[model samples]
Target chain A: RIISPEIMPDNKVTFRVYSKDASKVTITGEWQTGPGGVEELVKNDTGMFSITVGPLKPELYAYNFTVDGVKALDANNVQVRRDGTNYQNFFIIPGPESDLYFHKNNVPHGTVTKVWYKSSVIGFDRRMYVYTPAGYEGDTQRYPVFYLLHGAGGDEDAWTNMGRTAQIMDNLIAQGKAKPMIVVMTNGNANQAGAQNEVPPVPVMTGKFEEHLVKDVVPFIEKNFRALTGKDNRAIAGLSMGGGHTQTITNDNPGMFSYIGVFSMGIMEKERDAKIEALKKSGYKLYWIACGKDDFVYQSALTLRNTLDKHNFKYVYRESTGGHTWANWRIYLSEFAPMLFKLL
Target chain B: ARIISPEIMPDNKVTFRVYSKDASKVTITGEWQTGGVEELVKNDTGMFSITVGPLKPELYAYNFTVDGVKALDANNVQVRRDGTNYQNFFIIPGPESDLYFHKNNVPHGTVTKVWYKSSVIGFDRRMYVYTPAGYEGDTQRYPVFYLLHGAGGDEDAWTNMGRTAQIMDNLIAQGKAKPMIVVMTNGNANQAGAQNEVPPVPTGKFEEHLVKDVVPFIEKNFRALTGKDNRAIAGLSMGGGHTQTITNDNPGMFSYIGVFSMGIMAGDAEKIEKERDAKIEALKKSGYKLYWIACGKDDFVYQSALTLRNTLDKHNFKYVYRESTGGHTWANWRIYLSEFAPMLFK
Candidate 1:
């Protein structure tokens, strides 16, 4: 009957942990304003260590507890998400930005299904999550497909579990902000079938994942699902390492996709300038590159922009305010998805 | 950084440990315990330790009650969400529960989250379909088992908590049961999927949705057999209530029926007895293969299960009554599934 990380009416949150013997308890969460992102909880008369923090703005936040120098989750909160091998407890503070993050009854919801496809490139069966729009079931109409990828240590469940892709897509399409399309979230780890929990040991990336995506995943979706063909109807986007994958896949196959987005991934070396020239010559509809100002790859992103500028390529450069985090990645998807498949 | 609480020793004795320097009280609670709870002894170093029996090898869910509040195991990441409440779980090794474990060597089946339009409920709902390991590469049709979950849980319960897919995979791999498709559906007629995703709508009859919406959708979409002999239905607790209602209403629709930890209604028994007796008589003559009624001795509905047996006895209907030791918990339900599945489609 414990309620940790309780949200108040005024947007303030009170996080509580019951440990009568714990000498010190501290918390670190996304809502912190400082560099260290750490805060101590004040103990009450009832032996419960509690902390009341900010009338924070409306958005989803993740936090972890450190009790007696041991990392722990808020025992009361079951809304936990796994980041790579680490787990963090999360909650949404409902506001304009986070309204779509929750699955609401007012809107028509889409279905997120975990489907398997034969990956001849990887020589094993792999799993990917396919999000079909609300009315896609038993319907004759074909829809556009968006191939969404995750960073290192993430698998097929990354987007829907942590990224809230289905909720975002459902809300966006319900409001007519984004068109009805299928979102394919694949396990970018070339050797893995699904997530890390069902471990097959993540291997070093040899760019076989990009080749597998082009060869196995795309073809599987096209054959099994009612996905529309051609560049205008297809979009590819990813975060971090996945952004690197998107850059590589679209660069090698220039005319294959019209819409391409790279989020929080740094620039390529000058050696790949020839590839950029080939992409510029081949042409595509939209090339959107977004990165945070404080991202580790910020300079690399700048170099990427400079390289694209050397070829006089047309692309959209969105410089956001945050670092390389899911906060920015989610915001990037929220903004990027609405701009897809509109040329139809 | 996670504490390996409830470590199973070589002798089958389990040691439960919790680190607390200032806490005045600590106790471990689980379904495996007959009294439902046990207190832990604290060491000089402020650590709580308790060594329980060389217990029976089965899946168990337990929690630590720190001070006065119920808390989850911080060290154990294996968790099962029953409706809104979450419990940390672990499995002990043996033949009885070996199928529940996900052994890497066994060829695992693919559990897909499928969404279909439930015309009876008039909304698009979700269900999980577990196709065998070779299902993707092969084109063979298999029999379908409509597995239902109890109240407070959705379609994801059986696969997560009951370990349905792992059970089926192990059973099939060991040649104990035929390779088949297991469809776990959301029995809550009012909600679209899990209530955590969407809010509940106006309630409708779940029995109708299962028969009218789910069966046809699975048969049409998946490579499934389209005969009465090819379909099997089973459920636990409130789901067992649904199983009886469904099989009793649609006679001959399914060849095998299983009801676990639930029985007929006793309140206003005389009013519904006439109708139930008629249905039972009809099902007895409709020619079914198996009717299983499993109940725990300490269950709250144990008497109601007897009432159901008595009514079936009056009709002279044959059924297998499995009396287990534990109460209405997942431990018994998993055992029921393991025992009942082997007797199906034989």
Candidate 2:
């Protein structure tokens, strides 16, 4: 009766909505063309609107309905993705090839937990989602950890939700594409330790987050979880403001993390060459930067790439086709993780 | 810009106060028709407030009509919507509310988004299951509480604005309430995930799904205590209506029953009442633990609740009747859950 978006076995998706008073409602999403990056829906006599678009090229698409010009989540669809501070109604159309990472395939799944840690710097208890690979608890083994950060106005769940960090990691590790590692998505807002209604946040992009990360979060994780020590074992990455944090943290403390990923945002501070020289002294394994051409940050990213070229540093830059979207970051992470803590 | 006069005030009465720096007048026009247009006192404090309730135990929806401009309370984060209009919602937490509703430093429960094949509904369905703190590492089979959502709500309602996990964790931490697995399923059986906003014409599709599909799925996958004594069922509003039908239809299925802001809709169907009473009595004989009913004074369904209370009294059934403040809102339901959960599986 209330079929919002049903991904069919043959990739034929059916979207049914009950809009009582909508003169016209339109559906739009990623991987969509025309109709404002969307398609149209026709209203039936039952006060219900229906539309079927796409044998869509399989991908996890975030979409919404604009009923009479007012944007709304598909009230019928329960699945939501947190891209930064905004929540979008989304669905996954499974593909024969690439869509395998999106679905729950026949593999041992890791347990994702909402755990709290005290931050002495921020003077609060912060909440974070930590994904421990399958059989992590039962066995006595230490694992490499990735400190994943969210963008502006986004909390810890940002990466895990929209980034598909868990699924990608899970599938990758299962297929032996990457080593089993503990991915810790942390709340990067420094003034406030936690997410919304948790704590009153301080001003973001102020560079105060580095203090909290070094003094509290990273140490907290190392002390609590079975995280292996030293630079070679640790990896750090983020999107947007998170990208800015990645730049600042690696620049300030090059000896701390072995692998660094700057996604969507690029080279946010001064003394770029000095930072790389310190990073070289720090003996870094990989320096990765990912950005989309459509991203406003693309210009900044290009400048950073030009600087890297001038410096003649060993680094990897992957320029994707989309904007500063989660899709780009997700692909970046998938590519980035495999390169970390290289084979013997 | 906004404050609930007593963020932690006396449960009986609380005021919805807003601070508007320059507005000369503020009037509140909302649902729960305090019968007339109520005026908010505007003084030097630049604060405008209307003291409306010694009312009932529930969440209320109201919006400020400030000097002919109807605007939402920007200070209040809990905003509710019905169809097109949106209003500010406030909860005058009952006596136990502040204790249970608020998040305390307690061992929290994990709310997992689980999917199961519901052949009865003929679609893949998703529901939220709250497993206690030690559920993962520890291998202890616990009792089950089947919590249903209201008409427009999906499985996320209880955990989101309803704060089911917080209440459970807080109570269980203090040893007041038993730690158990609470299964919150969508009552709009026609819909799968969240509220699709379709008119919830209860074709009893959800009721059938709960009885046939949901119960079986939980029992199989989850480490749950079986039998009637181990299972408790409760809900609010339309879900409260479900409590009546499910327990009445399948008597000996659930040990404890809680109906908040709902009852038998039959106004004068004596035969239906007699049948319901017979089922209630039979359940009592079969180790029925608790029969609880709670409602708001302002609920349109208040008269129906009263009629059911009358029926229960006439049948000579020993049940708990709780009267508190607010209309047919989540505030009352939340408080009701706080009170009702502690009494179950004792």
Candidate 3:
């Protein structure tokens, strides 16, 4: 069977083989991470063979393995392509949003309406749902905005439809249970190397999503809507690649957001350690990390949590049910919405 | 609880009492047809006390002992406010529940449907056929019932909403109604492009389709007990109208006819009676066994039923008329089918 990161996680890939001839056969597997990357030899243990790779940065990588130095096709995995004379499987290691962006809520509940917006930078009229508070229509109150993002292959409607974000807000507001706030959901796959013009195409990220959300989308919302114009009011949050964006944006620009929520975030160990150190020096209000029990990203999230605990970093770490399904994201949003801008 | 039908099956209740210096105790207990009925007790030492109640309705009764004394209710006690004396208990049985039962002793037949191709019709039509449980490999053929549904309903209408599944499940379980394969079909024409638009011609076109296309298809494809005595047709609402029309047009084709809420001809008692007499004569000549008519009191079709019943009486035509509460609703239709289904092939 073909092994890829999409099937498992970023750290490991394995292949199993069974044959009657047990001796006089030397099995060897060779694979590579991405373009311009070195090919590594995989070790074989009896009939089972596996290769352990680095805690790579959250991004998609393509790879293939040869058995016994003879190139052999994966009989089980149907997702293979014929490029000249070679076949390969695609895998993705989603990014961390906190390392890229941040959003702090300082408004009334039910203010976030997830809407779709066209992006000149991305060249596609992508979707994004926005949330505006209940009193947003009548009051002239300026509020802080949080721009959220979804993972790869997920559209702008994923949060509201499958995530049930609107229902959570409605029930919370009906019971007078939450602080009102505004949220904007945007597309997250607009930046990354090798994502430009790939066959059987995928949404590429070129680090331009940061500029689009920060420069274009934020200013547009602030000008058109009654949004609070300050670092304390603005925040950013996302899952996977979106989480990587969160880390990148928050570390690059400190004090821009008072709170950040990351779910099953994908980020490198060195980069994450540096960002955590930077956040400690910056003194933000809240830094939250959440992941599910069965998630493949649970190991990475746990490592980050352990690092935070060791350094005495004041942040929330939560674990819930299921893998990277919409159900987990819905729970993440419910927990994150109430905690944002609480002290303010 | 009191018993309601002791005359049909008696000796269903028992009561008892005990006395003490400071206090007295009274107890009553009994078992119904299904067993497990709780009994209550009260006591008073100051004076002699007694308690009594009438029984419920059913086909069987049982006896109960009270305080070691086996005695029936007084049988002749002082009358209560309603002018009926109280008895200890009674018995009443509801209508037999329908269910499936397998009996090796009884002869069994099978039920199957036969489909035929019609050039004029263009589309293929199907008719349901039911043979008693074990007709396969046996050379015996059985009678047929041409069942139909109401407006906006198709061949599958009766099978789905009418609780035919539950009814059949219960009947076969209880060994009541004979296991039969019911045939249902689309009453509308194949040419009717859009279902929204009603047929341009009269209702006779649908009648002709059933008579000419459906009948020959069943007879030709399956092993049918053909002839007037073995054939029957019944329907509800629009299907009921189709039943009347088919029975009238080919009097010799069907020996049994049932109409639930509609009729072919309309008018006063005399006209209805005349029509019933003519139809009865035609049916009698063809050796018809049963002519059944039923409708709900609250239904708009009730007037037509009353008119038809009155006409049948005036013309001295033998038929059954059943009336019940409720509008043109499925509840009434299910009840009607329950009563009407048992009477068929009896």
Per-residue accuracy of model 1 over B28-130 as CA lDDT, tens digit each = 8886787768899988987888988787888888887766556666666577778777777778888788989876456677787767877788877878889
Q: In model 2, what lDDT does residue A17 have? A: 64
What ordering of candidates by TM-score runs from best to worst?
1, 2, 3
**Best-first order by lDDT:** 1, 2, 3
Top-lDDT structure, candidate number: 1
Model 2, A1-344: lDDT tens digits are 57778887777787776745556667777767536566778889977778887787767788876554334556566565655445567777776434534645345566565666666776655677787776574457999988888888788777777778877887888878788898888888765555653323443336667777877778877876788988989999988988888878888898999898999987563577788777767888888889998898899998877877776777788888889777777788888888877743
Candidate 2 residue-wise lDDT at A83 = 54
CA RMSD per model (angstroms): 3.5, 8.7, 31.9
Q: Which regions in candidate 2 have their CA more than 4 angstroms from the true location?
A: A6-14, A18-21, A32-39, A44-48, A96-101, A197-205, A269-272, A309-311, B1-57, B60-158, B168-333, B340-346
Candidate 3 residue runs with Cα over 4 Å from true position:
A1-344, B1-115, B119-122, B127-132, B135-138, B190-202, B264-281
Chain B TM-score by candidate, in order shown: 0.92, 0.74, 0.59
Worst 10 residues of 3 chain B by lDDT: B76-85
| Clash count per candidate | 6, 11, 100
